Design an enzyme around this catalytic site. Sequence first.
Site, PDB file in Angstrom:
ATOM      1  N   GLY A 109     -13.931  -8.339  -4.462  1.00  0.00           N
ATOM      2  CA  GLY A 109     -15.163  -8.584  -5.180  1.00  0.00           C
ATOM      3  C   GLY A 109     -16.151  -7.430  -5.227  1.00  0.00           C
ATOM      4  N   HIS A 119     -11.048  -3.984 -15.857  1.00  0.00           N
ATOM      5  CA  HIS A 119     -10.036  -4.932 -15.415  1.00  0.00           C
ATOM      6  C   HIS A 119     -10.629  -6.335 -15.190  1.00  0.00           C
ATOM      7  CE1 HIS A 119     -10.977  -3.511 -11.109  1.00  0.00           C
ATOM      8  NE2 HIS A 119     -11.080  -4.827 -11.017  1.00  0.00           N
ATOM      9  N   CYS A 153     -15.687  -4.589  -6.843  1.00  0.00           N
ATOM     10  CA  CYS A 153     -15.559  -3.745  -8.020  1.00  0.00           C
ATOM     11  C   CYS A 153     -16.856  -3.765  -8.831  1.00  0.00           C
ATOM     12  CB  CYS A 153     -14.360  -4.185  -8.886  1.00  0.00           C
ATOM     13  SG  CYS A 153     -12.811  -3.658  -8.122  1.00  0.00           S
TER      14      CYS A 153
HETATM   15  C1  LIG Z   1     -12.186  -5.224  -7.433  1.00  0.00           C
HETATM   16  O1  LIG Z   1     -13.181  -5.913  -6.676  1.00  0.00           O
HETATM   17  C2  LIG Z   1     -10.985  -4.904  -6.428  1.00  0.00           C
HETATM   18  C3  LIG Z   1     -11.497  -4.156  -5.170  1.00  0.00           C
HETATM   19  C4  LIG Z   1     -10.303  -3.863  -4.176  1.00  0.00           C
HETATM   20  C5  LIG Z   1      -9.846  -5.225  -3.727  1.00  0.00           C
HETATM   21  C6  LIG Z   1     -10.050  -5.190  -2.147  1.00  0.00           C
HETATM   22  N1  LIG Z   1     -10.712  -3.825  -1.777  1.00  0.00           N
HETATM   23  C7  LIG Z   1     -10.882  -3.081  -2.957  1.00  0.00           C
HETATM   24  O2  LIG Z   1     -11.370  -1.962  -3.045  1.00  0.00           O
HETATM   25  N2  LIG Z   1     -10.020  -4.041  -7.169  1.00  0.00           N
HETATM   26  C8  LIG Z   1      -8.655  -4.512  -7.446  1.00  0.00           C
HETATM   27  O3  LIG Z   1      -8.275  -5.606  -7.056  1.00  0.00           O
HETATM   28  C9  LIG Z   1      -7.674  -3.529  -8.235  1.00  0.00           C
HETATM   29  C10 LIG Z   1      -7.434  -4.047  -9.737  1.00  0.00           C
HETATM   30  C11 LIG Z   1      -6.355  -3.157 -10.487  1.00  0.00           C
HETATM   31  C12 LIG Z   1      -6.579  -1.615 -10.286  1.00  0.00           C
HETATM   32  C13 LIG Z   1      -6.299  -3.561 -12.013  1.00  0.00           C
HETATM   33  N3  LIG Z   1      -6.364  -3.561  -7.482  1.00  0.00           N
HETATM   34  C14 LIG Z   1      -6.250  -3.128  -6.092  1.00  0.00           C
HETATM   35  O4  LIG Z   1      -7.164  -2.493  -5.577  1.00  0.00           O
HETATM   36  O5  LIG Z   1      -5.045  -3.484  -5.347  1.00  0.00           O
HETATM   37  C15 LIG Z   1      -4.945  -3.001  -3.969  1.00  0.00           C
HETATM   38  C16 LIG Z   1      -4.681  -4.067  -2.789  1.00  0.00           C
HETATM   39  C17 LIG Z   1      -3.873  -2.901  -2.055  1.00  0.00           C
HETATM   40  C18 LIG Z   1      -2.631  -3.416  -1.329  1.00  0.00           C
HETATM   41  C19 LIG Z   1      -3.018  -3.885   0.137  1.00  0.00           C
HETATM   42  N4  LIG Z   1      -3.467  -2.713   1.153  1.00  0.00           N
HETATM   43  C20 LIG Z   1      -3.587  -2.858   2.634  1.00  0.00           C
HETATM   44  N5  LIG Z   1      -3.684  -2.994   3.807  1.00  0.00           N
HETATM   45  C21 LIG Z   1      -4.523  -1.844   0.379  1.00  0.00           C
HETATM   46  C22 LIG Z   1      -4.519  -1.776  -1.234  1.00  0.00           C
HETATM   47  C23 LIG Z   1      -3.558  -2.401  -3.502  1.00  0.00           C
END
Ligand SMILES: *[C@H](O)[C@H](C[C@@H]1CCNC1=O)NC(=O)[C@H](CC(C)C)NC(=O)OC1CC2(CCN(C#N)CC2)C1
Lengths: 293, 292
Positions: free
Chosen positions: B136, B39, B138
């Site tokens: 950040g 992603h 990931c």
């Molecule tokens: C990549 O670094 C990131 C890590 C996430 C962001 C914050 N903590 C993490 O583990 N991954 C993403 O952003 C991921 C990309 C998609 C799968 C393409 N999307 C994601 O994890 O969305 C999450 C935010 C969420 C809503 C808010 N909540 C509360 N309180 C928890 C989860 C859904």
Amino acid sequence: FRKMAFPSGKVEGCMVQVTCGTTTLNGLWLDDVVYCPRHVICNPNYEDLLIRKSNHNFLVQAGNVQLRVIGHSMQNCVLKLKVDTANPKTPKYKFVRIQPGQTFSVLACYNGSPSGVYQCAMRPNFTIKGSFLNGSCGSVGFNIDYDCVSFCYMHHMELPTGVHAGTDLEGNFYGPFVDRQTAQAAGTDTTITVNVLAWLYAAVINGDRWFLNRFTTTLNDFNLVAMKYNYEPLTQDHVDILGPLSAQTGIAVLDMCASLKELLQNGMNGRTILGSALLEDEFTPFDVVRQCS
Amino acid sequence: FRKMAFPSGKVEGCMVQVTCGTTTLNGLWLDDVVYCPRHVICLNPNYEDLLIRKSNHNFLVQAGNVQLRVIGHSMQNCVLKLKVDTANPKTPKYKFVRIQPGQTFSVLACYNGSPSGVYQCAMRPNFTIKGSFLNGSCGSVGFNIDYDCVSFCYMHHMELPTGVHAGTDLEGNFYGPFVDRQTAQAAGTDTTITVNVLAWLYAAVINGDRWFLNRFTTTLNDFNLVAMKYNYEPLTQDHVDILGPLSAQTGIAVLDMCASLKELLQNGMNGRTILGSALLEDEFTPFDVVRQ
Ligand SMILES: *[C@H](O)[C@H](C[C@@H]1CCNC1=O)NC(=O)[C@H](CC(C)C)NC(=O)OC1CC2(CCN(C#N)CC2)C1
């Protein structure tokens, strides 16, 4: 909230083994000095034991590679062995003496080989609750700030109660302990108030704020009350390290002390804080900020 | 007793930063390939199409103060593989493994390609993990070390609304029924890892904690009926076998410990604690307890 150690690679690159006769423990190789507990040379007279030692009686090894010793001296409870090779993996580093309640990572080592890494809090009685088996002496405790390693602990002994004691990297013990194989008692332990306060701030930051009261208190008032509940008295340094969390939340330290005083006298009344009926005291103000922000 | 991670140095030497566009995350540089979550290339993302449209030069890969030149790219499941023109000289001996639920591993949490923390996690029965992962994170990886070989088992992709985490193995296959799309996803009902709770009760007894023991006993099946009632995993005979060493060492039969756990589930701890905890802990394996 997780107990989280610092990445250990920079310290792994400094670990060596030091042997006198059959006795092997761990040492810390920084530039051209190896630091290790003086009891590698063994109610002993360390000065007369050391006078009998020559450089060529000390075996220092990084892995299976011998490091030749070219000087030796004792600083308090640590032996400093000058070696003929500067460690190419020496990080930027400092030696710091931490305060009780502060946390640090320990790299548990056996025969110079790291086995695991975990986070420790130094208790108010200067002991730590480690995972330290035989041969763990000379394992070190550290914090990492930027690329700078702050070494703060070197392991020397276990107490009758199963907790552990050691020194800073200048060889001075934390607490009223000596590196004799005698029976030694630690002070009665207390709860780390500053860390509980950090925890309450962390609860507020996460929106969990039922326990906040409308009053404030004096630091002396709190310290007198808190002693009745087996809580450490607060110092001015404690107030100072809560500054960032106080600023982040707008809640004065003494207002949080009043909230904690109420929790101590009245209890939880059946409620949880951060999903726990117990107050947590092993996360410092720094740990809270690292894991939230 | 204490949660202990593996020393992270061998993994630290492999972490790099990967940037495409306005998205930055961590990559794992082994030999001449950087592995990262796909992603990085971006609500319904057609990754094959987005990938065909990317050029090698779109990918900014930095190992510290050094850019690495991407000479090639492909995708395996949810993992992007960036071929670079330089082999990582710090590559350890390694393997890619898919762990089983209830097993544990160390996580090296990283941000901007820089290691920040290390801690121990278990793969939950519902294939989530309870990590500490922020924006950040990931591309942070999970791993175990055996002798000098690093077994990589997890790469971090997402957070679920409940605050738990999901990711893949290094082949890019998710653990669990999750998808790398920006949607709120729920996990299946989690359950408690029984064999680990038992290992931890044995740890408590070795450390002199034994208020929860009893003279009662139980059959394996009657234990499992009560366990399932409380959303604990059934205990298999192989799990009984795996507990053998701790049983031998304490002189407490596995099924006697099962009887103690049954009483704990049925009554509670009544304010008492075990190894400092108001809650029964299930992220220590038998191996984790023995090795320590
Ligand atoms: C990549 O670094 C990131 C890590 C996430 C962001 C914050 N903590 C993490 O583990 N991954 C993403 O952003 C991921 C990309 C998609 C799968 C393409 N999307 C994601 O994890 O969305 C999450 C935010 C969420 C809503 C808010 N909540 C509360 N309180 C928890 C989860 C859904």
